[PDB]
Design an enzyme around this catalytic site. Structure first.
Site, PDB file in Angstrom:
ATOM      1  N   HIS A  85      66.156  94.854  18.511  1.00  0.00           N
ATOM      2  CA  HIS A  85      66.788  94.791  17.190  1.00  0.00           C
ATOM      3  C   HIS A  85      67.358  96.171  16.881  1.00  0.00           C
ATOM      4  O   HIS A  85      67.325  97.076  17.721  1.00  0.00           O
ATOM      5  CB  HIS A  85      65.848  94.220  16.108  1.00  0.00           C
ATOM      6  CG  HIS A  85      64.695  95.087  15.709  1.00  0.00           C
ATOM      7  ND1 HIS A  85      63.500  95.102  16.399  1.00  0.00           N
ATOM      8  CD2 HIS A  85      64.511  95.877  14.630  1.00  0.00           C
ATOM      9  CE1 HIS A  85      62.647  95.901  15.785  1.00  0.00           C
ATOM     10  NE2 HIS A  85      63.247  96.403  14.726  1.00  0.00           N
ATOM     11  N   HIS A  87      66.856  98.665  14.672  1.00  0.00           N
ATOM     12  CA  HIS A  87      66.194  99.834  14.112  1.00  0.00           C
ATOM     13  C   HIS A  87      66.022 100.940  15.152  1.00  0.00           C
ATOM     14  O   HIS A  87      66.117 100.729  16.369  1.00  0.00           O
ATOM     15  CB  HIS A  87      64.836  99.444  13.518  1.00  0.00           C
ATOM     16  CG  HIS A  87      64.939  98.572  12.303  1.00  0.00           C
ATOM     17  ND1 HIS A  87      63.893  97.811  11.854  1.00  0.00           N
ATOM     18  CD2 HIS A  87      65.926  98.405  11.392  1.00  0.00           C
ATOM     19  CE1 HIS A  87      64.243  97.142  10.776  1.00  0.00           C
ATOM     20  NE2 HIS A  87      65.473  97.498  10.463  1.00  0.00           N
ATOM     21  N   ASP A  89      63.517 102.558  16.290  1.00  0.00           N
ATOM     22  CA  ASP A  89      62.503 102.462  17.340  1.00  0.00           C
ATOM     23  C   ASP A  89      62.930 101.550  18.485  1.00  0.00           C
ATOM     24  O   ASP A  89      62.191 101.430  19.469  1.00  0.00           O
ATOM     25  CB  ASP A  89      61.151 102.021  16.760  1.00  0.00           C
ATOM     26  CG  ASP A  89      61.197 100.678  16.036  1.00  0.00           C
ATOM     27  OD1 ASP A  89      62.204 100.357  15.365  1.00  0.00           O
ATOM     28  OD2 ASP A  89      60.175  99.963  16.099  1.00  0.00           O
ATOM     29  N   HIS A 150      60.878  89.886  11.521  1.00  0.00           N
ATOM     30  CA  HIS A 150      60.866  91.296  11.157  1.00  0.00           C
ATOM     31  C   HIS A 150      62.266  91.781  10.778  1.00  0.00           C
ATOM     32  O   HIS A 150      62.429  92.616   9.877  1.00  0.00           O
ATOM     33  CB  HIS A 150      60.321  92.093  12.326  1.00  0.00           C
ATOM     34  CG  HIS A 150      60.546  93.545  12.182  1.00  0.00           C
ATOM     35  ND1 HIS A 150      59.784  94.331  11.347  1.00  0.00           N
ATOM     36  CD2 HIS A 150      61.506  94.340  12.688  1.00  0.00           C
ATOM     37  CE1 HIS A 150      60.232  95.568  11.389  1.00  0.00           C
ATOM     38  NE2 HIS A 150      61.291  95.586  12.170  1.00  0.00           N
ATOM     39  N   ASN A 181      56.608  97.380   8.499  1.00  0.00           N
ATOM     40  CA  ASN A 181      57.776  97.737   7.704  1.00  0.00           C
ATOM     41  C   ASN A 181      58.636  96.497   7.507  1.00  0.00           C
ATOM     42  O   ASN A 181      59.300  96.034   8.442  1.00  0.00           O
ATOM     43  CB  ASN A 181      58.564  98.862   8.359  1.00  0.00           C
ATOM     44  CG  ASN A 181      59.512  99.515   7.396  1.00  0.00           C
ATOM     45  OD1 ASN A 181      60.066  98.847   6.524  1.00  0.00           O
ATOM     46  ND2 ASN A 181      59.682 100.826   7.517  1.00  0.00           N
TER      47      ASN A 181
HETATM   48  C1  LIG Z   1      53.758 100.465   7.185  1.00  0.00           C
HETATM   49  O1  LIG Z   1      52.921 100.512   8.304  1.00  0.00           O
HETATM   50  C2  LIG Z   1      53.503 100.199   9.543  1.00  0.00           C
HETATM   51  C3  LIG Z   1      54.868 100.279   9.788  1.00  0.00           C
HETATM   52  C4  LIG Z   1      55.352  99.946  11.054  1.00  0.00           C
HETATM   53  C5  LIG Z   1      56.727 100.038  11.320  1.00  0.00           C
HETATM   54  C6  LIG Z   1      57.630  99.104  11.849  1.00  0.00           C
HETATM   55  C7  LIG Z   1      57.407  97.664  12.265  1.00  0.00           C
HETATM   56  O2  LIG Z   1      56.629  96.962  11.569  1.00  0.00           O
HETATM   57  O3  LIG Z   1      58.091  97.173  13.200  1.00  0.00           O
HETATM   58  N1  LIG Z   1      58.839  99.620  11.909  1.00  0.00           N
HETATM   59  C8  LIG Z   1      58.824 100.868  11.462  1.00  0.00           C
HETATM   60  C9  LIG Z   1      59.865 101.803  11.364  1.00  0.00           C
HETATM   61  C10 LIG Z   1      61.292 101.432  11.795  1.00  0.00           C
HETATM   62  C11 LIG Z   1      62.040 102.614  12.375  1.00  0.00           C
HETATM   63  N2  LIG Z   1      61.925 100.927  10.582  1.00  0.00           N
HETATM   64  C12 LIG Z   1      62.638 101.660   9.590  1.00  0.00           C
HETATM   65  C13 LIG Z   1      63.167 100.649   8.617  1.00  0.00           C
HETATM   66  C14 LIG Z   1      63.173 101.043   7.180  1.00  0.00           C
HETATM   67  C15 LIG Z   1      64.588 100.532   7.086  1.00  0.00           C
HETATM   68  C16 LIG Z   1      65.558 101.468   6.480  1.00  0.00           C
HETATM   69  N3  LIG Z   1      65.600 101.251   5.045  1.00  0.00           N
HETATM   70  C17 LIG Z   1      64.665 100.539   8.578  1.00  0.00           C
HETATM   71  O4  LIG Z   1      62.556  99.412   8.905  1.00  0.00           O
HETATM   72  C18 LIG Z   1      61.865  99.554  10.146  1.00  0.00           C
HETATM   73  O5  LIG Z   1      61.294  98.692  10.725  1.00  0.00           O
HETATM   74  C19 LIG Z   1      59.584 103.064  10.844  1.00  0.00           C
HETATM   75  C20 LIG Z   1      58.283 103.385  10.454  1.00  0.00           C
HETATM   76  C21 LIG Z   1      57.261 102.447  10.572  1.00  0.00           C
HETATM   77  C22 LIG Z   1      57.532 101.170  11.083  1.00  0.00           C
HETATM   78  C23 LIG Z   1      54.434  99.548  12.021  1.00  0.00           C
HETATM   79  N4  LIG Z   1      53.134  99.480  11.754  1.00  0.00           N
HETATM   80  C24 LIG Z   1      52.664  99.794  10.561  1.00  0.00           C
HETATM   81  O6  LIG Z   1      51.293  99.720  10.287  1.00  0.00           O
HETATM   82 ZN   LIG Z   2      59.187  98.098  14.757  1.00  0.00          ZN
HETATM   83 ZN   LIG Z   3      62.176  97.293  13.023  1.00  0.00          ZN
END
Ligand SMILES: COc1cc(-c2c(C(=O)O)[nH]c3c([C@H](C)N4C[C@]5(C[C@@H](CN)C5)OC4=O)cccc23)cnc1O
Ligand SMILES: [Zn+2]
Ligand SMILES: [Zn+2]
Length: 232
Positions: A85, A87, A89, A150, A181
């Site tokens: 996807h 994002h 990561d 997600h 997230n």
């Molecule tokens: C809250 O705790 C947890 C979080 C996560 C986690 C996951 C996931 O769940 O895949 N992904 C994350 C991202 C990615 C880069 N981003 C950034 C974003 C915000 C949006 C921009 N407004 C794009 O959305 C996203 O996914 C950034 C930091 C944390 C996560 C996993 N485990 C946890 O415990």
């Molecule tokens: Zn993720």
């Molecule tokens: Zn993501």
């Protein structure tokens, strides 16, 4: 020393590999985001005398370290990568991959969202994945679009030779208490998308989440439970 590596175990900038099955590894890296440190997974699948990479290591420097760790531990060239996807990561590091001669791929929906959001953009579009339930073959894996979860574009990856299901960030680890997230998630559709995964890959032996520890098929039901309760 053999356990699955954890966030406190990997300094930001280093990458570790973990053998999942014959010719299947996960890669684990750590990154800072909004003042907290998180681990994240990707996949490596042997493709004859080449390697297929699934997802970056969440950043340019992490992804350069990933390539170096692959050369050290495996010694086969990474020729293609798929981002599951849009994002950071999953695509952060795509520019490093492209400069290293890796052909980078994602669905058109992922490419559009990455471009709109200012993330790095894979070069090649993966057609045939735009309807939920769609599947296409890509080297030694099958790519599957389960529906929005997600993110609206999230893909899952199955390695049929080893019955390894890589769920990406649509699948959470068993210790998860929250849906992670959810900024770009569809909490209403996510359980339905997980049900599609469960129905399509009933023989999965290993399930790998986008973040955290692999396990078995229970990760799928657990994910549906946590997401439904998050919405509750
Ligand atoms: C809250 O705790 C947890 C979080 C996560 C986690 C996951 C996931 O769940 O895949 N992904 C994350 C991202 C990615 C880069 N981003 C950034 C974003 C915000 C949006 C921009 N407004 C794009 O959305 C996203 O996914 C950034 C930091 C944390 C996560 C996993 N485990 C946890 O415990
Ligand atoms: Zn993720
Ligand atoms: Zn993501």
């Amino acid at each position: 020393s053999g356990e699955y590596p954890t966030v406190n175990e990997i300094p930001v900038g280093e990458v570790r590999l973990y053998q999942i099955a014959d010719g299947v590894w996960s890669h684990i890296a750590t990154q800072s985001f909004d003042g907290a440190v998180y681990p994240s997974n990707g996949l490596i699948v042997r493709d004859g005398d080449e390697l297929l990479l699934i997802d970056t290591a969440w950043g340019a420097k992490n992804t350069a370290a990933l390539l170096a760790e692959i050369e050290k531990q495996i010694g086969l060239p990474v020729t293609r990568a798929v981002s599951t996807h849009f994002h950071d990561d999953r695509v952060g590091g795509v520019d490093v991959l492209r400069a290293a001669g890796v052909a980078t791929y994602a669905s058109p929906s992922t490419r559009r969202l990455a471009e709109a959001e200012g993330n790095e953009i894979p070069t090649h579009s993966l057609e045939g994945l735009s309807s939920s339930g769609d599947a296409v073959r890509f080297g030694p894996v099958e790519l599957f679009y389960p529906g929005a979860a997600h993110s609206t574009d999230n893909l899952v990856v199955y390695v049929p030779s080893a019955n390894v299901l890589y769920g990406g960030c649509a699948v959470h680890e068993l210790s998860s208490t929250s849906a992670g997230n959810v900024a770009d998630a569809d909490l209403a559709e996510w359980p339905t998308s997980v049900e599609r995964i469960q129905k399509h890959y009933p023989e999965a032996e290993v399930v790998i989440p986008g973040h955290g520890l692999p396990g078995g098929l229970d990760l799928l039901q657990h994910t549906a439970n946590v997401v439904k309760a998050h919405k509750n």
